[PDB]
Design a protein around this ligand. Structure first.
Ligand SMILES: Nc1nc2c(ncn2[C@@H]2O[C@H](COP(=O)(O)OP(=O)(O)OP(=O)(O)O)[C@@H](O)[C@H]2O)c(=O)[nH]1
Ligand SMILES: Nc1nc2c(ncn2[C@@H]2O[C@H](COP(=O)(O)OP(=O)(O)OP(=O)(O)O)[C@@H](O)[C@H]2O)c(=O)[nH]1
Ligand SMILES: Nc1nc2c(ncn2[C@@H]2O[C@H](COP(=O)(O)OP(=O)(O)O)[C@@H](O)[C@H]2O)c(=O)[nH]1
Ligand SMILES: [Mg+2]
Ligand SMILES: [Mg+2]
Lengths: 49, 277, 439, 426, 431
């Protein structure tokens, strides 16, 4: 019983960590996509000019 | 039928969208206010596992007020098939479930032996005199001294303590006398250092104790030695630890067993973060 | 705390026990050296292995099972294999000169010599059990040891231990393909004894698993290693409630209570779904309805009998993994409105449902795929009397000319129980008809 | 909410369909692996139309691949997007049809279809609200015309009230690739009039001329023409998956464009088609697209619209457009061509505007047409039928298989009923 | 105790309501959340638990494409989650698909909401149903909705706003069929139905507002102001206020003639308003000019039959009176002889409010004209002439008879608009 309660508490901590990672990854993806699009547009402008 | 999931606008999606938005809002409110379990555990681990600098001795005699580390040496015991190997360090251990539910440390706190070599905030002990106001003093054999641990906290001082056995007071697993930490000042915090060899013990009583040497630590009011149970395992928030009790162990020749041998470890002069080991 | 003692007798029991006991070591993470890996400092709270694995002061875990045979050909490969250090030196019992597919050698002459050595080892294994659920038996009908030595082992087990549960996993002869010539003689005699000395007899044959491995896993050329794993997967889903947690757990007495209506009818059928290859699971959606729709199809039966000829009496559904109790009720309710599935009149509620949270664990490099949910159905059907019909047709067609009888009379067995064992299941066939009569 | 079942039959049908899943998986941001990687939230809004979700939230297409020879079945599987289909849905035989319609409809087509109809019964019964069917084949073959029209009739006996949409590549005079083309085309369209709600006629003559004049491609590969076809398939059904100002599903397209039950053969088109050199000179406006749409060189069939009359015209637009510009342009083109449209139907034109244009482009306009000029594509097949049937040439492969001579006289009479029915209103 | 229930059926009815409810939030100061950071909002909003202001509209459609645009848009927190009702498949511009086959499977949920909404209101004044004639849902589904409403609520007024099919420009092909089939049931269960079309608003945006490229998001703002001008006499205070019952008496002389025209003035852009002068004697002449009628018809062929002018904003009642007698002496504005008094004027105190980012200007005073006239006999003549040229050859018929509605309904509905056609000459002939 004692170690089962310990496992339950550790699982709760793992749930919080999983939620934090799930909210960070979307921000990273949005930043990468925006940077790639802006760089592509600038390169097109320069070559055309 | 078939099910798709979160994003797809099919079936009963509106109530799921409401429920996930409510859960996300609650999670952000809790983590912004700071009631998050991982944040509390992170603060507790940052307080506990802080690095610390030990004292450095010149003439090899342990001084009052110096910061030392208690280390049980390793011996090839044949008592049990499974037991901790290598030198162990005496580290305090708070209660796990109460430590998760509440931020503040709950006195009394138990002790343990951990495979640790670098001095951290959990295993630095300061040798103190019960008479106090001691400057330029040498710790001697057969003399009373006390051990105080700050424990990674700059707030309070805690001391080792033990008492006579009672039907309501016992160790966690070995059912022997226990050793704990209290902030009270009494005679149950005083310990004595004695020579391991019984023939020369009274001859060496009253001599300055060497540093980094095997000595016996004996309580005063109960006259039990500090002992480390290697074969009995304690589950802890920081892994598996050996047990610690107060009991005197004798072989067939009435010589103290390697369980009772303890060694006080100072800091390396070349690198203060590392020890003499 | 609730512990099972498994018995494996014959060559079938050892070879099933090689693949069955590999899964328990690979489910709890117990190495072939006998010790759990040291990389478990964070992990804890696990004591579910005590049903089968006994601790030691050195941290070693040894199985709670006995391996019995009358030849050293099959157990010496275990003793010199990968798992030589894991099993006990004495829990692997060897005989001499086997039984040669003869029931009299297995029961009266050779199976009498070593029965005292095995009975000591069971008793030496039963005192450590602070709580024992019962026994599990793996053997074969068509063998000499699996049918001869088993027939008196169940007689000695019932005398020593009174009302303890006895559950069987037997290798029934397949209707078309088989190996031994005199298999009707051995199959008739051993099940005449064990009608009253058993409590539940799960059966599976060898042809119906050949059909499964062809059209599901796309294996053209299987061996017994491919077949033993699927039988080894059924045993885990049956016993998973005693090991792991769940919303509804079943003990070894709970699904014995809900599958035998009368004392003479203790013959279920074993089925398993979903079974699929590694590639085809990657695309097909596995709903709770689609894994219980596969169990009711006659092509997925693991005994070569069509359930459409007969009527179900009682059923047991044993779920694993990410199963919600909502979808169990909706999938069962669809089956209740099916006309193809027929039920007897006196069992209005035939379903017993158990759920365990552990998803099914699959051996690395195996033919079957890693899935999150699976169901094993132990269904009782009247259509197993078709299986007894084709074998008793085979028996009197060979007993008429007194073929092979001198192998049985000249060993120590009287010819008088050749007729009585046929007359025993003549009345048993009358019993399956009267149960199926609608009131 | 609305679902569409896809079926791929014949060598020409599999290659167009495998090129068709290229376009929409890029539209919805699906990798060949099956994992969603897109940017907007409007792409996963309606993924249940064409896709099913699997374990791990991984997407699989809802299509059935049927054939008789594994030659083109392994070509699609070893393609760019071949590792996304269901491996059980790959249903095939071992013996080729021999470009014979009797091999695909009575002899080898009657054995495999029992397994073929099971997988399309699995996908239909698990849908939420099934909307219709979709099938790509060719009229001139033995596999694409044998079981191409056999799978249509069997589904009609199962699901009466749906919309059954097929895309058929029609025979042409100058791009004849088979000696027995006029026989197989007549034998297929006899059941296409009976049991299909809308049929699209696509001709290889017009596909090459678009690749030659407008696109200025000197050496068109068969991978190029299938991209021309795949644009019109995704344009006619874009109002089911994407939001817009004027939503029109497949059944809404059925009511406007089908005046009589036997006139449901359409000409398709794609509006923003431009060459490599002259992208800079062109200006993208709504009146520019309408002039491109009503060009004679832009439709996918080799029929002259100037030798006929138009019954019903629709045009599905894509992108951000003003609504006066769309509405006044399809009034100006009707007033400036008054004799070309029928006088017993007012307002032949039809409007459809969606919010989301295709990838990499600003606007789009998918063109559809009904005209009396489609009889010229049907007189040439019917006239080639007579010159081959009178001498009874190539009949002993059909008549020796289980087929009578009375089916050929029955099917030829159905063309001349159909040819006269377009001429009757002109 | 003055309450109005809005029902938005079809795509054209719902998409106007996207811009109709945008304007009502600005009038009363309600945020899109539903919060108000005194009680003139009670006509259109019901404050509920937690202070959220809940609207009084039911959004029903057989297709989930358009409602899910609002359930994911910027007005998610405003409407009730059970007032947004969807189906599975559309009507496909078929009358018998929105009324005979698919319209019966959702009609119990539609009337359950109207029954629940009406119990919260203390005094119910009328209904405001929005749809279009041409589509299947705006024809099939509104036909049985007001059929079941007229048997449940007897004497409550039913105000209708519909998109009339324009003469030369139209979207669908079967719209001559669906317009005749709608109006068979409207003449028995509707009390006042207002026609607007799409070609007249296009020419207003071209010439008056100076917009080169109008869009459906632009027309819905203009229709959103007329409905907010009719219901402005109940929300606010005025010199003399018009109730919903009392402009049904003075606009409906006969039970079969209840089809007035909606006209708003002044509709001016930003760059032109600060130059030219906006007097009461000029904004009422802008209602009578042939260019500014919002239905493609010429008023000069027919004669006016009943006129109602609803002034709002800074208006003195004197110059209204001098402007009416200015109209009556003009020979080109011809009134029927049997109705010597035909002008009903109404003054309110609240000026119009401009939506930010819009095309209209900030105007101090405005007038909405609701004119009953005989000029729409020409509008119903051209649509009947388009029905006869298609029913002669039985085109597009088998899509109707394949659902459950027999071919006998075409001839019965044709003879009814035949019957009401000569009712306009029977009232236009001078006595
Ligand atoms: N499916 C399966 N069947 C097995 C396996 N091993 C043995 N059998 C069955 O066992 C039958 C033959 O009898 P055995 O088990 O080999 O020998 P036995 O039961 O010990 O009898 P004796 O050799 O006389 O002692 C065959 O018909 C098989 O069907 C196995 O690993 N898998
Ligand atoms: N002014 C205006 N008219 C619209 C709008 N949307 C649709 N319409 C008109 O509505 C008429 C036909 O109705 P539909 O667009 O088909 O919508 P519906 O009435 O619900 O019919 P279905 O969508 O088939 O169910 C068209 O001719 C358009 O003129 C709009 O946003 N603004
Ligand atoms: N667009 C296109 N047409 C093709 C392709 N392959 C064959 N065809 C056409 O298909 C016609 C012959 O049909 P066929 O392939 O023999 O039918 P099948 O035997 O049933 O598969 C020829 O006239 C070709 O023009 C292709 O890859 N793309
Ligand atoms: Mg054997
Ligand atoms: Mg619509």
């Amino acid at each position: 019983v004692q170690r089962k309660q310990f496992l339950r508490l550790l699982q709760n901590e793992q749930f919080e960590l999983d939620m934090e990672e799930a909210i960070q990854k979307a921000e990273e993806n949005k930043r990468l996509k925006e940077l790639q699009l802006k760089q592509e547009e600038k390169l097109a402008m320069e070559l055309a000019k | 039928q078939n099910v798709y999931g979160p994003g797809v606008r099919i079936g009963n999606w509106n109530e799921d969208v409401y429920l996930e938005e409510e859960l996300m809002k609650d999670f952000l409110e809790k983590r912004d206010k700071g009631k998050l379990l991982i944040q509390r555990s992170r603060r507790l681990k940052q307080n506990l596992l802080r690095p610390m600098q030990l004292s450095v001795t010149e003439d090899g005699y342990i001084h009052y007020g110096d910061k030392v580390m208690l280390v049980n040496p390793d011996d090839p015991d044949t008592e049990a098939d499974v037991f901790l190997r290598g030198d162990l360090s005496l580290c305090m251990t708070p209660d796990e479930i109460q430590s998760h539910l509440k931020d503040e440390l709950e006195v009394p706190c138990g002790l343990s032996a951990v495979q640790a070599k670098t001095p951290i905030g959990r295993n630095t002990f300061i040798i103190l005199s019960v008479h106090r106001d001691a400057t330029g003093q040498v710790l001697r054999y057969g003399q009373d001294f006390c051990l105080g641990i700050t424990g990674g906290f700059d707030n309070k001082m805690l001391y080792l303590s033990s008492d006579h056995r009672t039907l309501l007071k016992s160790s966690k697993r070995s059912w022997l006398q226990e050793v704990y930490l209290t902030d009270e000042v009494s005679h149950v915090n005083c310990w004595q250092a004695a020579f391991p060899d019984p023939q020369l013990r009274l001859e060496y009583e009253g001599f300055p104790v060497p540093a980094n040497a095997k000595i016996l630590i004996n309580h005063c009011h109960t006259n039990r030695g500090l002992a480390a149970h290697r074969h009995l395992f304690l589950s802890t928030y920081f892994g598996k630890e050996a047990e610690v009790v107060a009991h005197t162990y004798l072989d067939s020749h009435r010589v103290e067993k390697p369980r009772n041998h303890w060694m006080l470890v100072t800091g390396n002069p070349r690198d203060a973060s590392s020890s003499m080991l | 705390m609730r512990e099972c003692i498994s018995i494996h007798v014959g060559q079938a029991g050892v070879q099933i026990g090689n693949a069955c006991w590999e899964l328990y070591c690979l489910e709890h993470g117990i190495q072939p050296d006998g010790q759990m890996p040291s990389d478990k400092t964070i992990g804890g709270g696990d004591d579910s292995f005590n049903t089968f694995f006994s601790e030691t002061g050195a941290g070693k875990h040894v199985p709670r099972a006995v391996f019995v045979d009358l030849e050293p050909t099959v157990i010496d490969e275990v003793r010199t294999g990968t798992y030589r250090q894991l099993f006990h030196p004495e829990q692997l019992i060897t005989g001499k000169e086997d039984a040669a597919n003869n029931y009299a050698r297995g029961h009266y002459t050779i199976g009498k010599e070593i029965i005292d050595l095995v009975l000591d080892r069971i008793r030496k294994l039963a005192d450590q059990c602070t709580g024992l659920q019962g026994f599990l038996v793996f053997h074969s009908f068509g063998g000499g040891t699996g049918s001869g030595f088993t027939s008196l082992l169940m007689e000695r087990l019932s005398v020593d231990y009174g009302k303890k549960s006895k559950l069987e996993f037997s290798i029934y002869p397949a209707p078309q393909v088989s190996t031994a010539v005199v298999e009707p003689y051995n199959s008739i005699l051993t099940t005449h004894t064990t009608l009253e000395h058993s409590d539940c007899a799960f059966m599976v044959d060898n042809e119906a698993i050949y059909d499964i491995c062809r059209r599901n896993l796309d294996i053209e050329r299987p061996t017994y290693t491919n077949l033993n794993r699927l039988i080894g997967q059924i045993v885990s889903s049956i016993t998973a409630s005693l090991r792991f947690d769940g919303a509804l757990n079943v003990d070894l007495t709970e699904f014995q209570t809900n599958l035998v209506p009368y004392p003479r009818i203790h013959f279920p059928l074993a089925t398993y779904a979903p079974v699929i290859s590694a590639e085809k699971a990657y695309h097909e959606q596995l709903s709770v309805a689609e894994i219980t729709n596969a169990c009711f199809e006659p092509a997925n039966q693991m005994v070569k009998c069509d359930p459409r000829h007969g009527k179900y009496m009682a059923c047991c559904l044993l779920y694993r993994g990410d199963v919600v109790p909502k979808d169990v009720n909706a999938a069962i309710a669809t089956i209740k409105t099916k006309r193809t599935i027929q039920f007897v009149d006196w069992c209005p509620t035939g379903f017993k449902v158990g759920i365990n949270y552990q998803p099914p664990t699959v051996v690395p490099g195996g033919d079957l795929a890693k899935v999150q949910r699976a169901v094993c159905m132990l269904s009782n059907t009247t259509a197993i009397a078709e299986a007894w019909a084709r074998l008793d047709h085979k028996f009197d067609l060979m007993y008429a000319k007194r073929a092979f009888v001198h192998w049985y009379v000249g060993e120590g067995m009287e010819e008088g129980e050749f007729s009585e064992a046929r007359e025993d299941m003549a009345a048993l066939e009358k019993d399956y008809e009267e149960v199926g009569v609608d009131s | 909410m609305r679902e569409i079942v896809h079926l791929q039959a014949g060598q020409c049908g599999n290659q167009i369909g495998a090129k068709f899943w290229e376009v929409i998986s890029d539209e919805h941001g699906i990798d060949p692996t099956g994992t969603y990687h897109g940017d907007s939230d409007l792409q996963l809004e309606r993924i249940n139309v064409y896709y099913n979700e699997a374990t791990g939230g991984k997407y699989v297409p809802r299509a059935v691949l049927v054939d008789l020879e594994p030659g083109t079945m392994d070509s699609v599987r070893s393609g760019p997007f071949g590792q996304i289909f269901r491996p059980d849905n790959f249903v095939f035989g071992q013996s080729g049809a021999g470009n014979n319609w009797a091999k695909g409809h009575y002899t080898e087509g009657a054995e495999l279809v029992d397994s073929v109809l099971d997988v399309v019964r699995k996908e239909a019964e698990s849908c939420d609200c099934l909307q219709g069917f979709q099938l790509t084949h060719s009229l001139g073959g033995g596999t694409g015309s044998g079981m191409g029209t056999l799978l249509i009739s069997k589904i009609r006996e199962e699901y009466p009230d749906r919309i059954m949409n097929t895309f058929s590549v029609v025979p042409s005079p100058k791009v004849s690739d088979t000696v027995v083309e006029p026989y197989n085309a007549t034998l297929s369209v006899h059941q296409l009039v009976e049991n299909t709600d809308e049929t699209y006629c696509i001709d290889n003559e017009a596909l090459y001329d678009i690749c030659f004049r407008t696109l200025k491609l000197t050496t068109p590969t068969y991978g190029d023409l299938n991209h021309l076809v795949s644009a019109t398939m995704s344009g006619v059904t874009t109002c089911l998956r994407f939001p817009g100002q004027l939503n029109a599903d497949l059944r809404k397209l059925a009511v406007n464009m089908v005046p009589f039950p036997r006139l449901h053969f359409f000409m398709p088109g794609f509006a923003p088609l431009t060459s490599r050199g002259s992208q800079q000179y062109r200006a993208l406006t709504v009146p520019e697209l309408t002039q491109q749409m009503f060009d004679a060189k832009n439709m996918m069939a080799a029929c002259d619209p100037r030798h006929g009359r138009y019954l019903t015209v629709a045009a599905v637009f894509r992108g951000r457009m003003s609504m006066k510009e769309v509405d006044e342009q399809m009034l100006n083109v009707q007033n400036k061509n008054s004799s070309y449209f029928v006088e017993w139907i007012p307002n032949n034109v039809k409007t459809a505007v969606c919010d989301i244009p295709p990838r990499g482009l600003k606007m789009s306009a998918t063109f559809i047409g009904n005209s009396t000029a489609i009889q010229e594509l049907f007189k040439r097949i019917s006239e080639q039928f007579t010159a081959m049937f009178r001498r009874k040439a190539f009949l002993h492969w059909y008549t020796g298989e289980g087929m009578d001579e009375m089916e050929f006289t029955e099917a030829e009479s159905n063309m001349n009923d159909l040819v006269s029915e377009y001429q009757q209103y002109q």
